[PDB]
Every structure is written in C-alpha cells, then in structure tokens.
Amino acid sequence: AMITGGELVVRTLIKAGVEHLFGLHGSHIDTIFQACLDHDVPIIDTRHEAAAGHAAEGYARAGAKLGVALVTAGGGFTNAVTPIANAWLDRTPVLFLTGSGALRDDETNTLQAGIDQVAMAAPITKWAHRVMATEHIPRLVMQAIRAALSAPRGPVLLDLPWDILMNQIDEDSVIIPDLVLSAHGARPDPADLDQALALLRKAERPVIVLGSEASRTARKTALSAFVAATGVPVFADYEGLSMLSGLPDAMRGGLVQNLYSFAKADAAPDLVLMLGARFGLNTGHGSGQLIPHSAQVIQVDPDACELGRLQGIALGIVADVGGTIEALAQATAQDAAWPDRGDWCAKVTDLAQERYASIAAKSSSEHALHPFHASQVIAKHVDAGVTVVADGALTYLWLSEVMSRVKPGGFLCHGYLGSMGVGFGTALGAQVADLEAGRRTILVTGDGSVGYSIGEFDTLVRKQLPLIVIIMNNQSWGATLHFQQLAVGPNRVTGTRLENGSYHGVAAAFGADGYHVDSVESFSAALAQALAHNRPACINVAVALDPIPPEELI
Amino acid sequence: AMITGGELVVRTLIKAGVEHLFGLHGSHIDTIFQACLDHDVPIIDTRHEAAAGHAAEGYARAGAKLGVALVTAGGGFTNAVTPIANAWLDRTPVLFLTGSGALRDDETNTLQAGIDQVAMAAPITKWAHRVMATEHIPRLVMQAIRAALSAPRGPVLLDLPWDILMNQIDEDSVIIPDLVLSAHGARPDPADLDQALALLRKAERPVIVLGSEASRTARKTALSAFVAATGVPVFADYEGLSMLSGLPDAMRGGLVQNLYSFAKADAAPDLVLMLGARFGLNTGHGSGQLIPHSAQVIQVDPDACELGRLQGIALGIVADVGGTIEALAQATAQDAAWPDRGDWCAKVTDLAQERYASIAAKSSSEHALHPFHASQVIAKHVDAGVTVVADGALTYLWLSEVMSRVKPGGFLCHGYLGSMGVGFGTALGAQVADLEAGRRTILVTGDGSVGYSIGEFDTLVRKQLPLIVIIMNNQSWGATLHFQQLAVGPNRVTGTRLENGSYHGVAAAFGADGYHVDSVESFSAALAQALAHNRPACINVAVALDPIPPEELI
Amino acid sequence: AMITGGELVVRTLIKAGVEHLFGLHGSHIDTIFQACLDHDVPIIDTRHEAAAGHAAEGYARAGAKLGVALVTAGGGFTNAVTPIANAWLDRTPVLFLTGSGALRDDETNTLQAGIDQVAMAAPITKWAHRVMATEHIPRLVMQAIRAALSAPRGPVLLDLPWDILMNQIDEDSVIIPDLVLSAHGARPDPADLDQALALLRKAERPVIVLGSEASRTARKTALSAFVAATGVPVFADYEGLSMLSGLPDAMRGGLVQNLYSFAKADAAPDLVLMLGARFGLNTGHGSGQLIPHSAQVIQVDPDACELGRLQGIALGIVADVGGTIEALAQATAQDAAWPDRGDWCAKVTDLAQERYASIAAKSSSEHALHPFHASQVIAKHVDAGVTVVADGALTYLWLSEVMSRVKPGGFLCHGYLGSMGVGFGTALGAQVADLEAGRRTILVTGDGSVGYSIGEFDTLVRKQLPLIVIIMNNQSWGATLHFQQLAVGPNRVTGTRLENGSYHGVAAAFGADGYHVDSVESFSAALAQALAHNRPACINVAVALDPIPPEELI
Ligand SMILES: COP(=O)(O)[C@@](O)(c1ccccc1)c1sc(CCOP(=O)(O)OP(=O)(O)O)c(C)[n+]1Cc1cnc(C)nc1N
Ligand SMILES: COP(=O)(O)[C@@](O)(c1ccccc1)c1sc(CCOP(=O)(O)OP(=O)(O)O)c(C)[n+]1Cc1cnc(C)nc1N
C-alpha cells in the first residue's frame, strides 16, 4: 500500500512507454533501480555516466523515441553534462533523471550534495527542475517527457532528491497520469502551405534540405509521397540523412555539403525548402556557399529564432517539421500537375558523383591505408539494416564522402558541440534500439576519440551488445595536428600525437573481439568477420594521417 | 554613410513595424534616443523604468502587438525586472532593450557596469542575450522580435553595451533584415481537429475557455464563425475576456470564475475546450472547481508542459491558439448542422445572472459606499471603445463580478505574478495603443497599489494621455488585512492599514484633475465628467473595507 | 508548544540582535509579521519594496550594522532587486528575507509563484538560497547573517516558501543558535604590517584612502590613534567620508576626487595606502589621475580580486580593513619615531581649498539659484549630528564639492550602480538608525530621482520619521540632458526635460510639510525651519540647470 518515490518514477515511465533506461548505480537512486527490477525494465549500466548519457541520446536518435538517462547525486550529474550539452545542440529528446542530496540535511556539507545541479543544466536544457515533494513525481516526470518530446526536441533535467525518492506514500492517493500529447505535430496555415507550393512549382532548380526534426518525427511514407509527386531533389545534414534512405535514387541529393560545387557549375538552387535544417555549421552558416543568397528560402522550424537567423528568407513558418511534411504530402496528393525536373534531378546526382569520383582518383593506399579507401570498405556494408555512428574528426569528415551514396538505417554524427568521444556511448545506446528493429550498429571513431570511453567494451560484453567499434588509427589527434601544420607550420606540432597503445588489446582484455588491420584486404575480412558474429567487436585500423579531406579545408 | 549602433537598432525596429517606445533616458542608450528623434519615433518617457516596462506590456496587450521597452545600464535594467517577470508569466510579447557597461573597460568597477544583466533576466525571459559586435545588431534585434512574437508570446532581453551602441559602421556594410515571420500560427492536424469536433458534437454540456494566447492573435471573426456554427458557450480568464466582446450574447459565459456554481446546480460542463487557458490560478489549478474532473478536456497550447499540467486531459494539442481557432472556424463552416444547444446556453446565462443578482441583494451602501456598487458605476460606462485596467486585490476581485455582463475593448488584469502596482504603467501604455484605436482607458486600482507608480500622473500630464485613474480607497492594503482577520484573528492586523494621504491631491499637484467621492451619486458624476473631458484624471473613491468578495473566499 | 516557521525567523533575528525590519506586507510572509507583533519588533512598512530594500541598506550604512529587508512572493522579490544590486556593488550588509510560492503546489501556475527568485539574485548576492525545511530556518538565517556581516560585506537572499513559514513544529526540539562570529576582523601578518609601515616611514608624500569596508567596521578610535602617530593625510570615497569626521582638520584630505589636481602642482602622492577603497569609478579606475602610476600602492582588501585589478601595486594584503586599522594603530602606539610631514598636511589642505575657492568664484545666483550656492546652504547645517543622503546626478556631483570640508555623521551617496531614485528609501532607513543615535537625516535629491519613491512621504508621515527631503529642481533629468548638449549637440535634447509637477504639493497631500524656494535666503529659512520641527519635510528648491560641475567633465 505504501510505495517509494522511485517506484512512482518507474510506474510513470512505464505509462509513458519507456522500455529501456541508461545509467550508473548510486544509492541515492537505488529506489529507481529496485522498481525497475520489479517491473522487468532493463537499466543498461555503463562504466561512465557520460557514456550512459550519450547512450540515452543514441537510443533516442536511432529509435526516433525518448531516451532516458539515470545518474546519481554529485559526480553522477556532473559526468552527464557533456551528454546534456550534446543533446541540447543536437535537439534530441532525452529525459535526464538525476539524484541529488536529500532536501533534509540541505546545507550540511554532506556526501554528493552542495552542488546546484539545476542551475548548471539550466543553460543547456529545455527544462531543468528539482522535485520538492514525493506526490509531485508522476505529474512532473510526465511534464518533463512532454517537454523533451515536443518541437524542437531537447534534453530535460529532472532532479530527484534522495529524500523525495526514499519517501513512502499511499499508492492509492497519488494518480499516475497518461502521456496525453498528440503524435501529429502542428502544421502550417493552408495559405502558407499554398504560398510554399506555389514557389516550388515555378522554381527552376528547387531543393529540399532536411534537419534533425525531420528524423525525430520520421514521417517516411509522407516524405516519399511528397517527393514522388513534386520530383524535387532532397538534401539533408548528418542527422537528416537517414530520412533519405526510403527515397528513389534519382531524388537523393545526399548530404548538404556537396551543394558547395553548385555555384561553379551555374546550378545554384533557385529555391530551397529547409525543413528542420538550421542556418549554422552544417548548412554553411550565412556564407551562401551551400544555401545561396540569390535563392528564395522557405524555412520551416518550430523555433522562430532560427527563421532566417544568418540569411534573408522569403517565407518563415513556425510549425512542426513532421506535421509540415504530412501537410505537404496531403496537399500534393490531389494536385497532380507538377513540372518534370528530371534533368535537374540528373544534374544533382551527377554533381554528387563528380565530387566522389574526384576524391577517388586522388586517393592511394600504396604505402599506408588511405582514410577514403577505409571509408569505402565500411560503405559497402551500409544499408537500411545498419546504423552508422561517426566520431573522430578527420575520421567523420572522410566518412561523410561515402555516406551520401548509401542508404543507412541510421547515421549519428557530431552536431554543433563537436565533442570528441561521444560516439562510443551514442553507438552503445543505438545498438539497444537497433536490437528492437533488427539492425546492426557500427561505430566509426578516431584513435583519440575512442580513449574517452574505452572502458565501455566491458559494458558491451556484460550486456552482450554486438556493437562493432571501428577505430581509424592515425596515431594522433588528427584534425588538430592538421591545424598545427597548416595554420602555424610543419614544425609546430605539440600535444597532438598519440604514438602508443594497442586498442584491440584493450578490447580483448575487456572480453571483446579485437582485430588489428593495416590494409584494404585485411580490413575487409575483419569487418566481414565482425558482422558475421553476434559479439562485441573492435577493429583497430592503421590509417594514413597526411591526406586532407575536402571538408576540412571548407 | 557612418551610422551609430543605436541607429541600427532603430532602423531594424522600424522595419519590424514598431511605432512607439517606452523608456527612461540614459547616456548609455542615447544613440537610440537620437535615432528615434531623426525618424520621428516617439519614446514615451516615464518617471520609473518599472512603469515604462509595464507600459510596453499594456501597449502589447491592448493593441495585440509588440511592446518595446527601452532602459539604461545598471539601475535602468534592475528597475525593469518586475515588468519582465510580469510579461513572462502573462505571456506578453515585449522586447526589452537595455544598455550595459561598455565591452571595453569590462571588469573595471565602473559606473552602471559590474552586474550580469543577462543572467538576472535568463530565468524570466524566452531569450536573454548580450550583443558582442555592432555588426550583429540588426539580425539579433530581429531574432529577439521573432522570439517575442512567436507562441507562446513572452519577453526578450536584448543587452546592448554602450561600446557597441556608440560605435559607428558603414551603413552599406551590414543589411537590415525584414521581419519574415508568418502572422498565421500553426494549426492542429486534421485528425486531431476532427476528434476534437467529434467530442464537441457528442457533448451534452460543452464549454470553451479562452486564455491569453487567444487575445495575442485576436482571430475575432474566426472565433465568431466557429461559435455561431457550433452554438457552444464561451468563457475566458481575465486576459481572454475582451475576445468575448464580439461574440453573440447567448454564447457568452463571461469570466471562467462563473463555472464555480455549476457543480451545485448539476450543470458542471460535460466537455471543456481550453484554448490558451492554462491549468493554474485563473482556472482553479487542479481542484476541478471550474474545469471539472469528470469533464473531457481538449487542451490546445503552444507549450507542451501545459498540456494536462495539473489535471488529466482527453486530447492534448500543441499548436498556435489563433491558428487553431482559424482552423476550427474553417472546419465548422463546411460540416453538418450542429445540435441546437439553446437550453444549455440559457442555463449558462442564468447561472451567471444568479451570481450577479445574489451579490447585488447582499450589497449595501448604507454607512459606506460598497465596492460592488462602485464597480457597477464603472460597468455602465464599459463597452468596445473602452479598455479597463485592474489592480489592487479586493478592487479587482469585486470589479470582476461586473465584467462578465459588459463587453470591454480590453481588460488588463493581474496575471500569475499578482504584483500590486503594475496597473498604472500598464494603463499608461494601453492608453497609447487606445489613442490610435480611438478608445478610452480606465484604470481601476487600490489605494495601496496606486502608490507604487503615483508619480506617473506627471507622465500623463506631460504626454497628454487622458487616462482616468479610479482609486478604490479602503484606507488599507485590503485583501492582506482580510487575510490577517480571517486566518489569524480580529486583533491581529499589522502593517496593512493606510489611513493617510490625499491621492486626488497628489494627482492635482502633478497637474491632473482630482476628484474625491464617497457615494454612488458623487462617483457617477465624477466619472461622467472625467469621461467628458480629454484630460488625465484621478477619482479617489472612499470605499467600504468590510465586504468580502466571493472570489476572496475561493 | 507548536510554533510557526515565521516565529523561528523572528526568534533567530532577535538572538542576532536585530531591532528593526523594513518591508511591505504579504500573506506569504504574515507569520513573520505576526511574530514581530508578539515580540515588539518594529517593521517599517513602506509603499514600495524597493524603498523598503533601500531603507534596509540605509539603516545598515548609517548604523554600521545589519539591515533586514522583508518582502513577499513574486512581485515583492522582483521589486527588491535594485536594492539587492545596489547593496552588492556598495558592499552593504543586508539580509533580504523573501517569501515565495509554497513548496507543495510547486509547478501549479499559482499566485506569486513560478519565478526562480534564487537564480535571479545569484549574480548579485554573496549567498542566495531557498529554505527546504522549517527545522532549517534558525541555522540558515544565522548562516545568512554571518555571510552578510563578514568581509567584504554584502547582500544575502534567504528565500522562505509560504509552506515553510506556515508550517508548525515543536519549539522544544529546534535549537536557536547564537551569533558566534568575531567582531574583530582578521589582521595582516606582522611582516606585511612592518613592510607597510616601513614604506610609510620613508615616503615623502604618503596618503591614506578609505573605502566602504572602513565604514562598516567603524574603528574610529583606532583610526585617530594611527593618524595622530604617523601624521598622514587621509582621503576617502563617498562611503568612507564619515570616517574622516573624527580626525583633526589638518589630516583631513576629504574626498579622493580632489587628488586630481595633485599631479599638476607636482604634489602627486609618493605612497598611497588603500584601505577598503577599490580601483574603479571613485578612485579614477586605472587612469592614474587620482591614484598615480609612479606611486607605490599598499592595498588592503578582503577580496584578492581587487588587489591591483586596474593598476600595478607594491603590496597586496588580503585582510579585514577594521582589523588592519586596529593593527596599524597598535603597532604605531609604541613606535613614536615618525617624520613630521606638517608641510605635506598643509599642502593637501591648501589644494582642497584651491578647488573650493575656484568653484565659488565662478558661481553666481544672479538670475537663478546656483547648485553650488544651494549646496553651501546645506553644508552649513552638516556636522556629526547629521546624516547626508545624496541622490540625483548633477545634484550629488555639486554637493560633493562642499562635503569634504564638513564633518558629517554619515554620507550615503551613489555607488557603482549609480541608480537614480535609491536615495529616498536609503534616507528613510537611515533616519530610523539616526533616531537611535540622536542624529538628523537630510536627503539631497534631484527632481527626477525623487519621482521614483515620492509615495514614501506617506511612510514618513505614518511612521513619524522626521526626514528632510531636499529636491534640487532643475526641471529635468539634468546630467543626461547635459550629455545630450555636450556629446551630441545643443539642439539634440529629447526625453530629458521635466517641466511639470509640484513636488511640495505632492508631499503636502501625503501629510508632510511642503516648502518651495527659489533663492538663497528663502532656502536658508526653509531648511532652518525644517530642522527646527520634528516632522517629515519636503523642500522643493528651484535651481539652475546650465552650470557644469567639475566632476561631470572628469
Ligand atoms: C552513499 O552513496 P553511494 O551511491 O553508495 C556512493 O556514491 C558512495 C558510497 C560510500 C562512500 C562514497 C561514495 C558510490 S560507491 C560506488 C561503488 C564504487 O565501486 P569501486 O569498485 O570503485 O570501489 P569499491 O566500493 O568496490 O571498493 C558507486 C558507483 N557510488 C555512486 C557513484 C556513481 N557515479 C559517480 C561518478 N560517483 C559515485 N559516488
Ligand atoms: C576546429 O576545432 P578542433 O580543436 O580542431 C576540433 O574541435 C574539431 C571538431 C570537428 C571537425 C574538425 C576539428 C577537434 S578535432 C580533434 C582530434 C580528434 O582526433 P581523433 O583521433 O579522434 O580523430 P582524427 O581527426 O585523428 O581522425 C580534437 C582533440 N579537437 C578538440 C576537442 C578536444 N576535446 C573534446 C571533448 N572535443 C574536441 N572537438
């Protein structure tokens, strides 16, 4: 009859539909651990709270659902701050559940207390709040979930004092609310949708650019219907890329990065329809190099701040991206009078091929394995049944060159934070979500980045998650070493070299399969072997450092 | 060719469509004052930054547009804090432009610097930011405006360093952006809209409740079309009241407080459609006294946190309230005949009438003028050409009982903050907005509350604003004195009596017309005379303290 | 046996030795009001929380003790923010006690809640904290007081939820702690004190500069002993000025401002001993105009950040200023071998006279009363039995010219915030403290500044505080109008004129004595008459606008 506050948390999460949590144990949060045991709710316990926080992100991004992180008081929270900051800029729906010092014995200099965790998370969350009463738990947890899941998606910090969690109350008096929040996002006014479709109809070279919000809602059947009716080529940033996987080949522009060479071929887009894609790092800021200044821009984003923040736009609609794609498909289903644009769809594909073929001709593995050749080996295994998680710096910049011609089930790369090392946790959580959908997860990381969470091979083995970790070992912090050589001088390299360590040996010591390769053939076999087994795998790949990816210079 | 940073602010403001500013001069913000002088943009300068901030709120609320407050470094900002907090909780679109210490001489213990103004405003603003470069001004001002105007509406702080404002750049080097933000808000998914209407048709006693976001968008014709087609009675909180003024009489429930006596009469609403109305103070929190626990609730709000915040709902839609109303009118114009609902509308009217009649029978002006009788005198002068601003606890609690039967052009009352004294500034700015709309502003306030900004009679006289200030003088901080008597004891009054001061004398000293009255006949005459003149006025009304308004008890 | 949380607050304040509180009533904080009634502890209730907050500052500054402000939830707190910011930069010990929304019904959109008051005050307090349990009240209130009173002095925000205050607990179980904090501040290491005294002994032109921390501890008998033994001239900023009142005339350098002309007469100080005085607005930043670059600087400040922040120093000691003055006196009491320096003490006095005599020759009241002549009239009445509070801009800049030759009991002027209008509240609280010591308080304010808190004449009358309010009426926001004329042009004056209002008429309407004067003779009589009566007084003084004070240009 009397239940704990931690029991109230879990019962509310269950009603919200959460099936997995990611965390690291603390006594402060044991009531949640105990309640999850009773309800058969798995908590994937990691070796670092950061890895657990990133895992919650990866699960959310790969699964297009809510991710739930569970950390303890003090160091538990502070270790989860990078994940929060990452999810903030990436717009990923994660409920960060954290313990804190009991409300009683406030200001007593006790263990794991004395830190204002809410204030620390306030600048990097949609909502950061501390629970003041055990009876408030169900409604506040549900409020937190509603905040995280709504447009634009983002992290929420819910702080649960040890006091509030251990407290026992009458279960018959406290109500557990349902998640009553519409799955269909708000759509544009018909007049705005008409104006958008009217501009798209008279455009000579229209282009659609998808952002992260297009991935969160994942209206794939609606997207295909709109694209098949209009015949407009679709581009996407890293986070929007997996949304292109269900589209016909002739309509796939790929990553927005290869819209760079369009100005030179006098093929700079006439109209650009930005759906969730923001003006920033991925879309070339307000330089006009990707999104042209001469082009008329229709931008749809749940945040009005983003509406033409770095560039003049022709139309700015505040609405949900999933709802807009749904609306665009619905309106165009009865239209049936759209221009051909087959020649324009051929031009965007040829220009993307022009880029890829140019890089291939300049790449050679005559002495050491070229990063681009290493990227191709992975690309050969990438389809709708595979989630690719990208970390490192040169590693991801090289990998992006092969990603726009394959159709991944998921592509989870760096966002605005660009924080090295987030990939391991991200991929771990992604694999948990991929197990549900019957997909395989592959992490492509740098030798520098992998060291951040290399202890997670233990978690892979303990939890039997068949994640394949590919380390692009160029014996250094690559892109930073490249900056030292190019921006300062060839003899000005310090603190960027990493000429030590057997990463596959580390993985083997944790119980995971460890491969080490230094050629195309050996890497091909190791990757094929890793895919064939239902085990955690590490593939340490010896890769050349000298080559400069086009995206580094740009 | 060379223009100041202040010029960039003003040129962006003009391109945004702002015609009035409210502020207090400072040397740090002089470049904005000088630029407004050149462009003939009037800055209504007050005697307190709080009044200027409140005036911008009142201008925003009465004119259903963007209010712009303009304050200086240090104390200029800190004096604007209450207006910011008030605009935050009330959801009013106000751009707060503030000066700050120069970026040069940072951390030099200089005049009006040394306080982190953004950090202070961050917990109570949609966005708070400090400009780092003069070149960034136009895009940042525009971004701030887009943030303020978008759902849910709210205040934005733009911190503009003296250094940044004084700096001069070539006018052709930085472009002034247009306000490219759709005036049409996002609307619900057709499926959600159809479920809402399906519930509305099936309901036996359906009710609509409007909130602040309905007033901000002001889709009056759409609301009228939707209401007439469905025949469903409409209620509103304080801020949504003026949106009932264009609606047919039989469909008017008045203020949401009227729902209280519906449970006793077995007439508790079967269904309630909440449009912008949040679960909180004005709707009876989660008590179920106004919004019944047994009712099926359709809630429409731009913020997902609010959806079923304190009470379980049947359907939670995240969308713009104005866009939703427009979508509801559009859908109900082209569907099947809706049920009559004539008898239910009559029941709503009669219960509101029975409350009004019950108070009138218990109100007696023998010995001293009764607050309800004083409220009736004002009520006989309220219509579409009148904006009523309410302050002062017991004052507005009594005044609310007469506001449902009348149809004001605007009704600006306390929100969640419930800060005494905000009314004067609010009414001052509302009068500026009413002047271009051809309306008259009347402030109804307490003797305690008026003292906060009593120096604004000077501003009324200097700027020739014909605001009528009605002071309900019960010679005390009334409601708080009642709290002491009811909750503690009869001999337990302390710090709540104000048995001093001729407020009509104060106004006269500032040059305003000053009336002192103590009866129905004398107050009627004074108010009639004040309405007949194009002059600012103060009517000091001696009123009884003992009467307890129904709304105080509940 | 069972007592409220508000009772615990008052019992703790009593044990701390507080005899007065300054506030404005709210139901949220009624338990404190009720407990003060029972214990005969006066709460000076004002007409604005800002005035109450400033009153707490003034009481603290004039009394050299702890000031206690008491404000309610929501608007109560936000109205008190300017006082907090002012006390923060001024380093004045004030305990800001604020109500807030009950911890139960957190996140319920209820009255006066939903604002994070702690986060808003965090950037401008030594400590901002919310009380989480009724049992914690006594220890946390005492902790707050210890924080405010210790070096450097500053404001503390203690947030007391309505919940926590109304809660009743067993009085026999909760202990009320004593204030156990040493009144003698920490002193420098003997080696540092020796090095300081050794530099002072060989110096040709040594000067002592006192800051606010010298006033807070007020070690007057120790200061005189050190000055009489060494014969070093003593300067002070506005806040340190009253500490010079017990010194011999030949040792009084006055305000640090007249150290400006020392470089021209080749009398730029050889050594400067800064005691609590910071590098900033009052000491001419790091320009070298007051504190020379060639001079060796010994700086003593409880904050290490301040130790040579804008200028190179020779010795930096982190210690309490009161403890240092005590230590300097103790060491020099047995020394008795100090150089004469009578000629240097004569030179500093002559240079101060040179300044005063130069201004007098340029001042004329032939057409309108000159601000300097008006300042002289006040100066004639200023001694150890008088506290002078200075507001306005030109008003205080002119008044500072006559202050360095009189010996005020107190001088409370603007600090770094420079916030216009703070003077009324400041003076009101100062008068309460002056009633204890048998002193009279005189506020010298501008016509612009007085409008901020002009309703406080009511409080003066209600509480029978004999404060004399002198308004220097130049029909405008003077210094800002001067900036428009000098920095932009003679025809570029907007929003700075105030050609309306009878301020004495306003004061008379509130029940206070109202004088209006426009000549030396009439002002002399009005001031003499105001001093003769034990009543609140307003002296509206017609004063010339055109004259430019030397401190404005500098
Ligand atoms: C009472 O609180 P407890 O939860 O029991 C814990 O916080 C603790 C217990 C006793 C002393 C100090 C800390 C402890 S003790 C503890 C186990 C440490 O395991 P380890 O194998 O390192 O040493 P040992 O105890 O087996 O000798 C954990 C995970 N926590 C929670 C925790 C999680 N993540 C981070 C970053 N810091 C933490 N303190
Ligand atoms: C331009 O800025 P850069 O400093 O060069 C850097 O931030 C970056 C990020 C994205 C693309 C290119 C460079 C990068 S790139 C980089 C090297 C990564 O080395 P890694 O071995 O993982 O991959 P690779 O580049 O050698 O293939 C570092 C250390 N940083 C700074 C950094 C430090 N610590 C953390 C948590 N995150 C970071 N991003």
Ligand SMILES: COP(=O)(O)[C@@](O)(c1ccccc1)c1sc(CCOP(=O)(O)OP(=O)(O)O)c(C)[n+]1Cc1cnc(C)nc1N
């Ligand atoms: C329940 O809380 P209460 O303390 O009773 C109070 O906050 C209140 C009471 C009923 C409705 C709304 C607010 C009220 S009501 C109230 C008295 C208002 O006096 P006034 O003479 O203005 O009008 P009236 O009641 O006599 O008609 C005060 C001082 N307060 C606290 C307060 C103090 N300072 C500021 C800036 N805002 C505030 N709300």
Ligand SMILES: COP(=O)(O)[C@@](O)(c1ccccc1)c1sc(CCOP(=O)(O)OP(=O)(O)O)c(C)[n+]1Cc1cnc(C)nc1N
């Ligand atoms: C150099 O900056 P300035 O803007 O000129 C100003 O801040 C100032 C402060 C100290 C000395 C000189 C000027 C001043 S001086 C000033 C005029 C004060 O007029 P007042 O009638 O009170 O006295 P006087 O100068 O005419 O004798 C104003 C409005 N401001 C800006 C301001 C606005 N609102 C608040 C709460 N505090 C402020 N300080």
Ligand SMILES: [Ca+2]
């Ligand atoms: Ca690498």
Ligand SMILES: [Ca+2]
């Ligand atoms: Ca009243």
Ligand SMILES: [Ca+2]
């Ligand atoms: Ca003046």
